[PDB]
Each structure stands twice: as C-alpha cells, then as structure tokens.
Amino acid sequence: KKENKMREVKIAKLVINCCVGESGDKLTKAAKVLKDLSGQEPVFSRARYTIRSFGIKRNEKMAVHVTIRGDKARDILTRGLKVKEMELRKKNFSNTGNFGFGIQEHIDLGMKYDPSTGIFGMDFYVVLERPGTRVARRRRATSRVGNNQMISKEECINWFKTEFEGNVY
Amino acid sequence: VKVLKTKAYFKRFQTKYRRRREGLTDYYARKRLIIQDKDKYNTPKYRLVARATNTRIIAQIVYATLKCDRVLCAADSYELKRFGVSTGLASYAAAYATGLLLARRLLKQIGLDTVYAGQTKVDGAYFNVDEDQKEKKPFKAILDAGLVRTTTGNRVFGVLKGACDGGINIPHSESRFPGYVRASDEGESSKYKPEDHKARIFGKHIDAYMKHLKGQSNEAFQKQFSKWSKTLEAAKVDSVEKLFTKVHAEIRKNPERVKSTKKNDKPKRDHKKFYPTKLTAAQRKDRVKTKFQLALSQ
Amino acid sequence: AKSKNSTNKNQISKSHRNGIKKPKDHRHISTKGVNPRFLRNRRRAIKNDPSIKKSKNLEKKVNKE
Amino acid sequence: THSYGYRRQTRKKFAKAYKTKGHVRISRYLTTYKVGEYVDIMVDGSQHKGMPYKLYHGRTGKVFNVNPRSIGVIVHRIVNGRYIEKRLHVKIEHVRPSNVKTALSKRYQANDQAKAEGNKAGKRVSTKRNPGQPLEAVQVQGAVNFQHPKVFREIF
RNA sequence: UCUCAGGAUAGCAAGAGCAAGUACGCAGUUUUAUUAGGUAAAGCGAAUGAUUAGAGGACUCGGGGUUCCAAGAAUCUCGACCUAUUCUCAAACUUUAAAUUGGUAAGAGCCGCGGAGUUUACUUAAAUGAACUCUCGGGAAGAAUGCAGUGCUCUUAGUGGGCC
RNA sequence: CUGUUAAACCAUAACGCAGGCGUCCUAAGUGUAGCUCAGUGAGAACGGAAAUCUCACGUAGAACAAAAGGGUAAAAGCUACA
RNA sequence: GUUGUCGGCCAUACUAAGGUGAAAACACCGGAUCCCAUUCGAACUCCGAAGUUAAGCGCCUUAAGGCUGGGUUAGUACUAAGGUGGGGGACCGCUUGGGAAGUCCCAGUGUCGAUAGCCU
Numbered sequence A: 001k002k003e004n005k006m007r008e009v010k011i012a013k014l015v016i017n018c019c020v021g022e023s024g025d026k027l028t029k030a031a032k033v034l035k036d037l038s039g040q041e042p043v044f045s046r047a048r049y050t051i052r053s054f055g056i057k058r059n060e061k062m063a064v065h066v067t068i069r070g071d072k073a074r075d076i077l078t079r080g081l082k083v084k085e086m087e088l089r090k091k092n093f094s095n096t097g098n099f100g101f102g103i104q105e106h107i108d109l110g111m112k113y114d115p116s117t118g119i120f121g122m123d124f125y126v127v128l129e130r131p132g133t134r135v136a137r138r139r140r141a142t143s144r145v146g147n148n149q150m151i152s153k154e155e156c157i158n159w160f161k162t163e164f165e166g167n168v169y
Numbered sequence B: 001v002k003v004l005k006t007k008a009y010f011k012r013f014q015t016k017y018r019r020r021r022e023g024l025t026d027y028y029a030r031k032r033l034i035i036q037d038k039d040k041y042n043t044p045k046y047r048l049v050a051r052a053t054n055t056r057i058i059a060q061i062v063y064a065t066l067k068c069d070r071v072l073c074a075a076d077s078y079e080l081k082r083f084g085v086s087t088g089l090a091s092y093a094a095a096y097a098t099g100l101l102l103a104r105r106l107l108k109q110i111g112l113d114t115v116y117a118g119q120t121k122v123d124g125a126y127f128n129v130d131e132d133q134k135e136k137k138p139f140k141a142i143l144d145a146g147l148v149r150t151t152t153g154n155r156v157f158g159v160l161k162g163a164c165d166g167g168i169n170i171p172h173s174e175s176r177f178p179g180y181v182r183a184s185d186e187g188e189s190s191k192y193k194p195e196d197h198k199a200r201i202f203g204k205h206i207d208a209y210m211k212h213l214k215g216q217s218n219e220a221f222q223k224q225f226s227k228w229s230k231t232l233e234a235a236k237v238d239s240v241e242k243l244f245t246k247v248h249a250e251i252r253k254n255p256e257r258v259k260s261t262k263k264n265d266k267p268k269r270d271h272k273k274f275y276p277t278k279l280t281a282a283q284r285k286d287r288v289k290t291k292f293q294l295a296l297s298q
Numbered sequence C: 001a002k003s004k005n006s007t008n009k010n011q012i013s014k015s016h017r018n019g020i021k022k023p024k025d026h027r028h029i030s031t032k033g034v035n036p037r038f039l040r041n042r043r044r045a046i047k048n049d050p051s052i053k054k055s056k057n058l059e060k061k062v063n064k065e
Numbered sequence D: 001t002h003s004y005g006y007r008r009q010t011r012k013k014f015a016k017a018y019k020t021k022g023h024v025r026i027s028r029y030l031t032t033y034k035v036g037e038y039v040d041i042m043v044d045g046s047q048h049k050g051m052p053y054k055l056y057h058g059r060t061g062k063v064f065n066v067n068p069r070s071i072g073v074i075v076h077r078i079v080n081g082r083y084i085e086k087r088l089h090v091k092i093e094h095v096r097p098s099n100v101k102t103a104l105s106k107r108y109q110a111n112d113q114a115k116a117e118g119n120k121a122g123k124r125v126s127t128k129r130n131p132g133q134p135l136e137a138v139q140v141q142g143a144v145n146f147q148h149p150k151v152f153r154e155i156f
Numbered sequence E: 001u002c003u004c005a006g007g008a009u010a011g012c013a014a015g016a017g018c019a020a021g022u023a024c025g026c027a028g029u030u031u032u033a034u035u036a037g038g039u040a041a042a043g044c045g046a047a048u049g050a051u052u053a054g055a056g057g058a059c060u061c062g063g064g065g066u067u068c069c070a071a072g073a074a075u076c077u078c079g080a081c082c083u084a085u086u087c088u089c090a091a092a093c094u095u096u097a098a099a100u101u102g103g104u105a106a107g108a109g110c111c112g113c114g115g116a117g118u119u120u121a122c123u124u125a126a127a128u129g130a131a132c133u134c135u136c137g138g139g140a141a142g143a144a145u146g147c148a149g150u151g152c153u154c155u156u157a158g159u160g161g162g163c164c
Numbered sequence F: 001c002u003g004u005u006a007a008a009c010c011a012u013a014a015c016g017c018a019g020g021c022g023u024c025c026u027a028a029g030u031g032u033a034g035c036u037c038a039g040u041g042a043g044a045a046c047g048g049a050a051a052u053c054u055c056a057c058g059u060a061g062a063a064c065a066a067a068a069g070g071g072u073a074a075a076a077g078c079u080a081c082a
Numbered sequence G: 001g002u003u004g005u006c007g008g009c010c011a012u013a014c015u016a017a018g019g020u021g022a023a024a025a026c027a028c029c030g031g032a033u034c035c036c037a038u039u040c041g042a043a044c045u046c047c048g049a050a051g052u053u054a055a056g057c058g059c060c061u062u063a064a065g066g067c068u069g070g071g072u073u074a075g076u077a078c079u080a081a082g083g084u085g086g087g088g089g090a091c092c093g094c095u096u097g098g099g100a101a102g103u104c105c106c107a108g109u110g111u112c113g114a115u116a117g118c119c120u
C-alpha cells in the first residue's frame, strides 16, 4: 500500500444547532449565544409541520443553527469535547465517517451568564472529509467521490483518538 | 435494508444525455442560444465560447451545424507564451488577451481588419464596432458563458472586451463588466468606472497584490508569485501592465496562427500497453476455466 | 317518442356515390399564411426586375428609378 | 363521446415515447426547411405551443410558408365525400422532413445517369421498374428431407 | 331550431348547360417507395393496480408467547425488509406488440450546393442566403390493371319515425 | 372538459362506466438567477412515533389553484429578486 | 495510440466492486489583498503553483445487474377473406392471406464529429 498526503483527514465543518421549539425571545437569546460563540451570523430553521404537543405551527421560526469551518470550529471542538471529558460512544459515529455529540450548559464552553442567556441545549455535529471533496461540491463536471477517497467509521474513530487524545466506548 | 435499487429501477432509468451526465452542456441555455429564425434558411449563427481552465483561457468562435458544431477560430491562452508569458494564463488580463487574439484572427480570416480596428487605447467604455459600421457590418457573435456563474466582473466578460475591442460585434450591456455599481440603500446611482475595469484588464490588481505580499513578508510573495516573478524578470520588466501592453501591441500587430513545424514519426509503444484492448469471448472462457480449477483444487 | 340517436350507416356510401372530389392543382397558389416580410420582398423584387414584363406606365415608373 | 376538446382522446398518442422524457432533440432545432419541401408532422408533448390537432399527427404535408418559429404546411382532409385543403402552421418542434422526395431525387439522378450513358452507346435504357415476376425455370440438385405427418401427442 | 309527428340546412336525386374532356389524366384496385398507429395478443422473477403458495436470510424493524435462570441470555410465534421463487388477473395498467387499416408519393410544372438577373428596414460579417426571371448540363416517357362513370356551372323535386 | 365503452388515424349510440366545469390567481401572469423534491440507511443535548441538524443514496416514486389524462429535473418543481 | 474545448445521436454510454495510469492537457491542490460570494472563501468569484494520481477522468476486469441485437417461443396467440362447415350451445375446425410477445439460449456493450494539441 502506497499513501498520498492527499489522504489527509480534515474537519469539513462543525455544525452547532440549537432547537428551542419556540418563536419568541429565547430564540433571539440562542441567536446571540451563537453569534458570540461563532463570530458568525446564526441561521434560523423554520418549523415545517404543525404539532400541538410541540406547539409548532408550520413555517414558524423554530431553531437556530450555525456552520463553522477551520480553526474556529477546531477551537470550539476543543471546547465541547473538553466539556464532554474527551469521551464518546460508538453510537456517536455514523457510516459517513462523521461523528456528533450533545452538550447542554453552554456556559461550560466559557461564555458568560445573562438573563437573556439562560442555559441552553446544543447538538454538535462534525463532518470529516478527505481532500477530493470538491469534486462532489462543485457545479461544473460534478461527480461522486471514489470509494478509496471516502472515510470509514473505524477511520473516523481513529481520527478522533489520534487527534484529540480521546476515549471511545 | 430494503434494497431500494431494484432490477426495475434499472429498466426504468432514463439515461440522461452523455453531454449532461458529464456536467458540461446546459441544454436549456444552449437551445436558447442556437435557435435562429428558420426564416434565414441555412444562414450560420456565431457564438463566442468563453471556457476557463485552471490554466488556460480558451476563447472560440463556434456555430451550430446539425452533425457537429464548428470552430471558426480558436485562441488558447498558451499562445501568450509565444509572446513571453509563462504564468497567470488564467487571469482576467489573460482572458482579455486571448479574446483580442481570437478577434484579430477571425477578422483577418474574413478580411475585416482594415475596416475594423477597434478602440486601440483601452478605456472601459462600451465598445461595440456596431456604431461606426459602414460598408460591411461587424462580425456578429453571441457570448456563451456555459456552466460558469454570471458574477459581475467575470473572466468571460474579459474575453468579451478582448473581442469587441478586437472589433467583433459582441452584444453586451456592460452591466456585469468589472467596476459596475448598483446601489441599494437610497437608490442612489448606477456607477460605471472604466478606470477600475481597464486597471483590471492590464492586471494592476495583480501588481497591487504583489506589493501587499511584499509588505507582509518575503515568503508571502514567494508562495503565490514564485514562477510569476521569475517570469516577470525574464521579460526584464517591472510590472504586468508594461508586459500586457507588450502583449496587446504584439497581438494587435502580428496576430497569426503559430504553426509548430514539428514533424513526429511513430513513438507509440508505451501507452498502447496502458490502453488494453477488450478481451475475446474465448479469453473469458479461459478465465472461467482457470478460476474454476483454482477453486476446485482448493 | 323514441328515436335512433346517431347512425353513420348510409353516409359513407352516399359519400362515395359521385366519387371523392379533389381540388385542382393550380400552379400559382393563394398567399394565405405567408408572412408580410417575405411578401413585401416579393413585391419589391418583382417591381424592380426587368426580366419580368410590367405594364407600360409601370415600366415608366421603374425606369425613372 | 360527450366531450369534444382540442386534446380529447389524446392520451397515448401524445404521451412521449418510452424513455423520451425531457429529450430536447437539438436536431429538430437545426433542420433546414424550404418552401417546396415535403414535411411529415409529428407531435411532441413537452412542447405545448404550435401543437397541431391530433388528426394531423403522422400526416404528410407539403411546405407552403416559412415563419421564424414555424413551418406552414399543407394537408388535406376528407369531409363529406370531398377533399378540403387545410393550411397548418406547425412550430418547429412537431415537424420533421419526409424521405418521400429524398428517395425520388436519389433514384432519378442515378437513373438519368444510366440513360445518358446508354444514349452515348445507342442502347435505349428504360428506368421503368417491374414488380415481382414469375420465377424462371430452374434445375435443382439437393439433399432430400422426407417428412411424415406426426402423430398427435398431448403435452401437459 | 319551445326543437322530438314539424321546419330549414348540407348529403342523396333530375334536367339544362360550360370547358381544350393536360390522359405525362383518373381509380372504394394492387405494386413500389417513404411513413404513421397503441388496438387483438402477449406481459406482470417490468412500471401502475390488484393477489394466492412454501423457504431462506451474516446484516434487520417491533410485537407475543417459551425457557431458564434470571432482565439477560438462550428460544418458540407473528408480521414488516431483502434473499431466490410461486398461484390468478385488469376497459378506465403496460415494457413488447400484430392482422385489417391511415398520410404522402411513383418525372417535362423532373433532377444538378454551374451560370447571369431582380429585391427602396427581407436574411447574412459576407453576392452570404432566400423567392421569382432568362440561361447551362442530363432526362424513351420512368410499375401492374382498367377507363361503354372528365371536370365544373345553374335551377330544382323528394327525404329528414327506418328495419334486417 | 378528462379517462373509459371505442375495437392501433379520424368518426361512432344508450336516463352506458368514473369524474369534473359556471369559479380561482398582481401572481398562482411574465423574466432572470440559484437550488433538487418524495423517500431510504447510518449519526447529534431537552428530543419520546413524529420538530430540527449530517452525510450517503435517491429516474422523479414530490410538486405544479382546481377532474382526469398527458407534460416537466442545472425545470414547468423549490428559493430570491424584477 | 492519448488530451482538453464545443458537440449530433442519447445506456452497446447506465449501475456495482476492482486493476491500471508515458507524454501533454484536465483535475484534485495552495491562498483570500482585489471584482464577486455566502450563516459560513464549502460553493460562487478572484490570485496563484508547495504537493499529488489518492479523487474526478481515459482504458480494461467480473460464467457481473441493467441496456442493445439475434435464437428459441412458434407458424403457437391474434388476425384478412369464404363457408347450405361441425356443435344444443359455449365454441371448434376446412380453403386462400398476414403473423406477434415473456421464461430459457447466444452474442454486443458506446458510436459519429469540428478545433487545438501530447506521444521528438
């Protein structure tokens, strides 16, 4: 077996999403929380269907999500993973080679407390990609990446251990 | 897992156009472009293909024949090598140049050079020869931008300028030309600043860039410009603008096909091996017998 | 009341009785469905063509131009 | 029939042929048409404008006018025991060239050639085509396969 | 068509005529050339809709009963998911797809990117194209068979409950 | 007005089948651009059958005011703007 | 022999898991000051040149799925014309004409281009 440094395992994006199931000030609060964590502008996901138990009317503003790349999401992964004690479960790893973990108490990320800032829940999801991702994501001559280019679960766990010095159960 | 790709699925597949599954042609667009009024029965229709490469800027004049589409004139950015540019063949200026060359060539082929010069000094002002046409109308071409986005200040429009300045009629409204401004806040102005555009045609932007990179560090300037700087030195010039005015005048002056006189005879052995022929039925049979025995004795 | 609603029985034979009439092929055909652009062209290219014999006063007009 | 509308009973005639879904068919875009050519007229369902009435699908008309997006064609319809001329205007989409003349011209030119040459040699050549003709006498030397009528058997 | 026992209106019918009865014309016929069609059938280990049979299944989605000991594991029972199949079907299903049948044609008003013309918002960068004129070159007559029903005007009767 | 009866051009009856029309829309008309929907597998605090976020796969199985049939995938679908 | 660019036909081109990769191109690739662009320089846009065939892509491999063409099916089903044919009938069959489709077989698996090139 010959290996190119082309095979590098990269963090594609960290998506951090917060679902409050409400239209109101708590939303604006999670927005702020997110801006303050990312340095970017938060994205508002709507509420697609109506449910009485969840109090969600279709096309209603529901949740706040953020897409972060590079050193930002790197540094933050530092934050949350540490918040998670650098410990994950195999159930946390998908067949995409991409992993995710939950966090509550966003304060444990190192952000201050305000009445508008009351403690929030967050889903952290990490996409891992190899180098040729572009082929799939581009417009002209769009094509699907090769079998040898795509990242296996075992490979992803390996990435988490090898990089973060973490434990998996 | 329910198998969601069935035998059926395949019987039912509508195979898309070879050209569309390659992500090359936009047929909606293309049809829009090619349609001419059957009123002019057999009369040809001329489109300018601006195709950008991670290296070369290819500008062509094609028209649509049933069996095939035909190329009238082809300008490959590498011809700028012939005039002394080894690097940055994908830039705005490169587009401009290539377009100027395709222009002059077509115009020479027809015999319209004399009648049609273009604006020799470059402004950024709308330039279409169609205002001063007198005896023989300027050549008509349509811009085919292809899969590329129409973003304001796109290379394809560099080629645009190259070619209408070269003297071809290339209908354009200058709205997506670099240095065009549409204001939002108070509904202020439609601003055209030909200065920024021309500046971009010559590559002043690339120069200001060199300078920035120098300001920060030597490594910075090295990383992005290594080949570009050694190349700027080989022409013994201090700026891209002087080099591209050189390219401009040389192109304007003796633009022509450079015919490479190289004659090659028979060096094929290597890659005839890399490009295997398909196997005979007998061969597959043999394969089967082999796998069979290997299996049996195991 | 009761009636027979639609029968096409005798009508086919009736139609073949005297033959099926077909129109006459006329060298020159009417101009319906032909656009004015082309039509004006024809008008002009005829007016100016000397190899096409016009009326007398017409030729006077054509020869003056 | 209780309903009469431009598309009535158009279901399978106009549905695109199998795996024709969304075919643009650039060839029709490029076909050149002239005032005297013979056109065959065939509808496509994706292109709604300049749609002929179903009756005229698969008819052969003679071109009469040429408009920018459309060819004027000429067809005839038998009505009450008489023929009635109908001037159709078809959008380019639903039209294709008929080979009925192409065959003719090709044939003619070749034939004429033959006749001219023969005229050179004093031999009159005739281009008249004769239909299938009674078979000429023959001798046959072959292997005899003698068949006998089979007994009946039931296959269940 | 207040129209349903009626009226007009075409069609069918008679008489008087017109025209060179383009026979290279005509045809409820074939032949030949170019072409249409989704019916019959067939097909549902192919789409849509139904719809029986048994088995397997590393990997499965849940239920129940079994057992043990214990809450888990082992295991019987169900279906759902594939696995390889299988029974019988559709006018408002269909990939496939006939017979009978529909267009258009089978030359002097022919063929040939050969000529010279004509075109004042027709076409093209383009004497480019296009349409028509006068030219140049070639062209045994360009399938069988039949023609004691050639085409067209004019005026007008009866009919408009049908039946086998 | 659509699909059938209807018998592969067209045409074809019945108080024959199954349904639909006397409205609705300044956008649901028109144009440009970008995007790909239905659904399936695996994965992420509260989160539970079902809310959002991810990736892989998705011939079209979704959507297109209204009935049916046909038509549509860098669109006729979704988003934004004019 | 091989490449990019624009293609006509639109699976013999698609789907799956692999082998292979001269040259030149194409790409992956590096970077966000500038025109342009987003929640995010992922993409779109711009500027490049430290790496690399690992992706994409060419070419081939599978007693591969699919698709394409022939064979069987079968002169079977259906059908044109005739019948003072048979049968109580449903229906079947005689004379003269046309003539299919699935299981199962066997073969094939992209073709035609204009333009500029690589293989001295």
Ligand SMILES: [Mg+2]
Binding pocket: B026, B029
């Ligand atoms: Mg476009």
Ligand SMILES: [Mg+2]
Binding pocket: C014, C015, C016, C017, C018, C019, C020, C021, D080, D081, D082
């Ligand atoms: Mg009559």
Ligand SMILES: [Mg+2]
Binding pocket: D012, D013, D014, D015, D016, D017
């Ligand atoms: Mg059809």
Ligand SMILES: [Mg+2]
Binding pocket: E005
């Ligand atoms: Mg009475």
Ligand SMILES: [Mg+2]
Binding pocket: none
């Ligand atoms: Mg009367």
Ligand SMILES: [Mg+2]
Binding pocket: none
């Ligand atoms: Mg008489």
Ligand SMILES: [Mg+2]
Binding pocket: none
């Ligand atoms: Mg005769």
Ligand SMILES: [Mg+2]
Binding pocket: none
């Ligand atoms: Mg007949």
Ligand SMILES: [Mg+2]
Binding pocket: none
């Ligand atoms: Mg056919």
Ligand SMILES: [Mg+2]
Binding pocket: none
């Ligand atoms: Mg009627």
Ligand SMILES: [Mg+2]
Binding pocket: none
């Ligand atoms: Mg009703």
Ligand SMILES: [Mg+2]
Binding pocket: none
């Ligand atoms: Mg669009």
Ligand SMILES: [Mg+2]
Binding pocket: none
């Ligand atoms: Mg087959």
Ligand SMILES: [Mg+2]
Binding pocket: G076, G077
């Ligand atoms: Mg059978």
